[PDB]
């Protein structure tokens, strides 16, 4: 059964005939997945989505198991086990041929290779991993499960495929997922934690012979060692039968802070955390109505909430949330993006793994990675919102609803929005350049820091304060503050900082305000494309014509770039700016007044020396006092054994300029040059039958923006990777 692949265009009737010109190639890679553009049926669509999801999960399992396997046979884990400080983890040993021989990343113990930065060993310092053979079995299990569920997808598409009413039970969906998936998985992981994790963590305090430490089978029914610690953990005393839980104060506690013997927090808090979450959203997810004639009729809740300003409230919204798919796609994407960036903005003050704040390399890598993904996908959420607007709507089921009530007064909204953006924009940046001029003008008293004209963000200070003294009264059964950047003592280990309180002076003001500024303009562009998607004050045929089209002729002057995804083009440029300066700010502060070295007096000698109070106020200072440090080694960071990785930062500029080439130029020029080369080739009887044709302007715009983004992000990650290598 192999007679079927090499029949291209199997899904489209038009491009199935033959490749007249090169255009036929391009569209082949463009319409391979939007099968909503293939028929009007839906069960087929849903089945395709299921199978694709299974395939994605399969590649997930594959790559994670393979990365394990590399971690088992080519990673200095079990030597780095006994010492997580004096050894830097590595993997991917270099192949000894011409060109890659000097790149032996030797990290002590003779182990060459590649000094990695992804902190998987940190998980492998919490999971309590002794020997690589169990890990070998783990990879085998991962890959076999991958193949298993792939076979399952094949079966559920080719032999027994689900029916159509199987789709729209969002009630049972929420119930099953919320409760069974999340709660059961979380409580199972907590059970694994208490049984194995903290025992071996105890056993990792003084060199207690890791492999000699017994295996879980020595604790499944062997409660003796389990009765050594935690006297209540004899069996459990099972006082839950007696409803008494005071005995369990041994392991299931509440400390809430840094544990200076683990490089992370107190794991017991995380275990009790997971317990509480498990049962909490179990009883939550038991809410909605199902097959027992009991529960909320959720399509009536939204009917109730209306009023004077509401119009008619949230009436008629489920046809949108189930009949169409792009809606759900967009909203869930936006939510995930936001969630991810708060995760990023979160796990640098509460490190949840062992040896995190003490390891000053994996932190910002993880941070920036997740932060980039967040935006990079929330813009896509907004794009799919717009594609819903153009693909799915209804004039009938959308009378006066809270939806329709904005599309009727969009002009006021967007006008006031533009107003706000202009205001904030110059109110911040022109102020900045004003201070710039003053410093360059021998008028230093007209500066704006503490030593000059004043402004102080009292609100952040007061909120941090009221957070400082929280325990005792707001948190009686709590020992230490939630973090130590708000308040508390400077927590550390060795000559190496873990967390100190962070200071907010004057420079914070304009930075946060320009953050808000760019977010405002981003929303402006995206929402503008959103509202003005179907009908503009000049183009009343937009939705009547599509959302992916270049222009509408030189009428009314010009009209090029009047679709919506060009709006999201401009938006993605802007969000690039946003996140770039955001990571600039984060890195510079957390290397300027949070991180460095320490003396026996707890004397934090930071890396840079507090440069914001000195230079992060004028533009010329911002280039001097940031990239002077961020590159002064990359010029010479090559030229020895553990340096030879000449980085492609020198290389990314080229792709950047090659990028911008595509933007500024039209296409007819290239078409004519093509025709001349064709003339020559035809004169020498080598004319390619398939007649080449230049790119379409939207295609060229896309490749230009793609190359632009690629070059920029490659440049910046090269920058701070080498910068951390210079200190980590």
């Amino acid at each position: 059964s192999f007679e079927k692949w090499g029949q291209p265009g199997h899904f489209d009737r038009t491009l199935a005939k033959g490749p007249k010109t090169t255009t036929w190639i391009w569209n082949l890679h463009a319409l391979a997945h939007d099968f909503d553009t293939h028929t009007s049926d839906l069960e087929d669509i849903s089945r395709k989505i299921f199978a694709a999801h299974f395939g994605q999960l399969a590649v997930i399992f594959l790559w994670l198991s393979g990365m394990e396997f590399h971690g088992a046979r080519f990673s200095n884990y079990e030597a780095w086990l006994s010492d997580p400080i004096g050894i830097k983890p590595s993997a991917q040993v270099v192949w000894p041929i011409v060109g890659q021989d000097i790149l032996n990343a030797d990290v002590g113990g003779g182990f060459h290779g590649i000094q990695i930065t992804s902190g998987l060993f940190q998980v492998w310092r919490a999971a309590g991993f002794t020997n690589s053979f169990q890990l070998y079995v783990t990879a085998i299990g991962g890959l076999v499960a991958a193949a298993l569920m792939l076979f399952a997808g094949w079966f559920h598409y080719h032999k027994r495929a689900p029916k159509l009413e199987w789709f729209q039970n969002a009630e049972s969906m929420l119930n099953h997922h919320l409760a069974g998936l999340l709660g059961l998985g979380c409580l199972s992981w907590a059970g694994h934690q208490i049984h194995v994790a903290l025992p071996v963590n105890k056993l990792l305090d003084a060199g207690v012979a890791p492999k000699d430490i017994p295996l879980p089978h020595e604790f499944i029914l062997n409660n003796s060692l389990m009765a050594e610690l935690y006297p209540s953990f004899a069996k459990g005393l099972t006082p839950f039968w007696t409803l008494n839980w005071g005995q369990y104060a041994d392991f299931l506690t509440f400390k809430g802070g840094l544990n200076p013997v683990t490089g992370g927090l107190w794991l017991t808090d995380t275990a009790h955390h997971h317990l509480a979450l498990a049962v909490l959203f179990i009883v939550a997810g038991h809410m909605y109505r199902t097959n027992w004639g009991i529960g909320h009729s959720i399509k009536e809740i939204l009917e109730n909430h209306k009023g004077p300003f509401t119009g008619d409230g949230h009436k008629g919204l489920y046809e949108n949330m189930t009949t169409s798919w792009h809606a759900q796609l967009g909203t869930n994407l936006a939510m995930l993006g936001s969630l991810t960036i708060i995760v990023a903005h979160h796990m640098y003050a509460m490190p949840p793994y062992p040896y995190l704040a003490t390891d000053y390399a994996t932190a910002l890598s993880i941070f920036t990675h997740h932060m980039w993904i967040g935006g990079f996908l929330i813009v896509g959420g907004a794009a799919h919102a717009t594609i819903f607007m153009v693909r799915d709507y209804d004039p009938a089921v959308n009378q006066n609803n809270v939806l329709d009530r904005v599309i009727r007064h969009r002009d006021a909204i967007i006008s006031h929005l533009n107003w706000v953006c202009m205001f904030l924009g110059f109110h911040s940046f022109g102020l900045y350049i004003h201070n710039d001029t003053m410093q360059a003008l021998g008028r230093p008293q007209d500066m704006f820091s503490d030593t000059a004209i004043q402004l102080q963000p009292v609100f952040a200070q007061f909120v941090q304060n009221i957070h400082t003294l929280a325990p005792g009264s707001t948190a009686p059964n709590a020992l230490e503050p939630v973090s130590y950047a708000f308040g508390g003592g400077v927590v550390a280990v060795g000559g190496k900082i873990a967390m100190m309180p962070i200071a907010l002076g004057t420079a914070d003001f304009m930075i946060h305000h320009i953050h808000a500024f760019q977010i405002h303009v981003t929303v402006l562009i995206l929402l503008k494309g959103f509202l003005f998607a179907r009908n503009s004050r000049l183009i009343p045929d937009k939705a009547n014509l599509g959302f992916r089209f270049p222009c509408d002729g030189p009428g009314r002057g010009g009209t090029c770039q009047v679709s919506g995804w060009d709006h999201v083009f401009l938006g993605l440029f802007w969000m690039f700016n946003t996140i770039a300066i955001a990571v600039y700010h984060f890195s510079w502060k957390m290397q300027s007044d949070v991180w460095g070295t320490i003396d026996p007096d707890g004397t934090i000698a930071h890396i840079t020396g507090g440069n914001f109070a000195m230079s992060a106020n004028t533009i010329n200072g911002w280039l001097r006092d940031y990239q002077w440090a961020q590159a002064a080694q990359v010029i010479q960071s090559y030229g020895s054994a553990l340096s030879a990785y000449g980085l492609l930062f020198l290389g990314a500029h080229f792709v950047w300029a090659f990028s911008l080439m595509f933007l500024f130029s039209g296409r007819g020029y290239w078409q004519e040059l093509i025709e001349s080369i064709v003339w020559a080739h035809n004169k020498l009887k080598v004319a390619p039958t398939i007649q080449p044709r230049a790119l379409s302007i939207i295609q060229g715009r896309a490749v230009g923006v793609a190359h632009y983004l690629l070059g920029a992000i490659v440049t910046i990650w090269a920058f701070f990777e080498a910068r951390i290598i210079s200190v980590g």
């Binding site: 490749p19 000894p96 021989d101 000097i102 035809n682 004169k683 009887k685 080598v686 039958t689 398939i690």
Partner: protein, 141 residues
């Protein structure tokens, strides 16, 4: 071979580098050997050799035969490509097979590029390489 360039045999800095010349590959003689192979050319103050291109037998073969090798292989590949293209059109399945290569036919054409130069010379003398300015109908202007 003038311009103030010392022979790579007796350039002191050349052997100075050669001493701790970082032996690249998995064989200890790698570096030293190559430096020994670099005595024929003539170094300079930079300690590294420049190449002279004149047909002058001091460095003639160090540039001529690679050029001729490239000409050989480029002629072969261009010749076999043009021949394949010419052949395809006598099938009336032109753009069907433009993406599906007919291997049982694509092989012997590749294997039969042995005598491309002189055969091409023949097609030059026979005039079997160009079509006529007006017969070629590709309209300019």
């Amino acid at each position: 071979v003038g311009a103030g360039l010392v022979p790579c045999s007796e350039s002191p800095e050349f052997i100075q580098r050669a001493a701790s010349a970082r032996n690249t590959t998995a064989d200890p003689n790698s570096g030293q050997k190559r430096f020994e192979r670099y005595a024929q050319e003539l170094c300079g103050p930079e300690g590294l050799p420049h190449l002279i291109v004149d047909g002058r037998l001091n460095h003639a073969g160090d540039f001529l035969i690679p050029s001729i090798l490239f000409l050989y292989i480029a002629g072969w590949i261009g010749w076999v490509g043009r021949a394949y293209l010419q052949e395809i059109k006598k099938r009336d399945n032109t753009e069907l097979r433009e993406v599906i290569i007919d291997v049982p036919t694509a092989l012997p054409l590749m294997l039969s590029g042995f005598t491309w130069p002189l055969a091409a010379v023949k097609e030059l003398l026979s005039g079997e390489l160009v079509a006529k300015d007006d017969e070629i109908p590709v309209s300019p202007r």
